[PDB]
Amino acid sequence: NIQENVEASKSRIKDTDFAKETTQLTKSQILQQAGTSILAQAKQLPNSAISLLQ
């Protein structure tokens, strides 16, 4: 019985709740994709406006 309770507590402290972490992983994937999209739009147009200026 004590081992059952201790295992439950250890899982609580350590084991990752797959729902929360898969949600976090999807959020991080979305954030990475958004950051890449912004960087593609930030590395080219702001630097390339000058050539139009000339």
Added chain:
Amino acid sequence: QALNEESVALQDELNRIAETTSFGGRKLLNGSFGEASFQIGSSSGEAIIMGLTS
């Protein structure tokens, strides 16, 4: 005498249980736990005192 021997064995078992059950090093039923707090609120001033009499 046989019943008394079994009873004394069970008494020593009760003593062992009282002196052994521990939540990862924290003795629970040996009377040393006393009244312990448990912060269960965002701010300061939220607690639930638990007592584990031996």
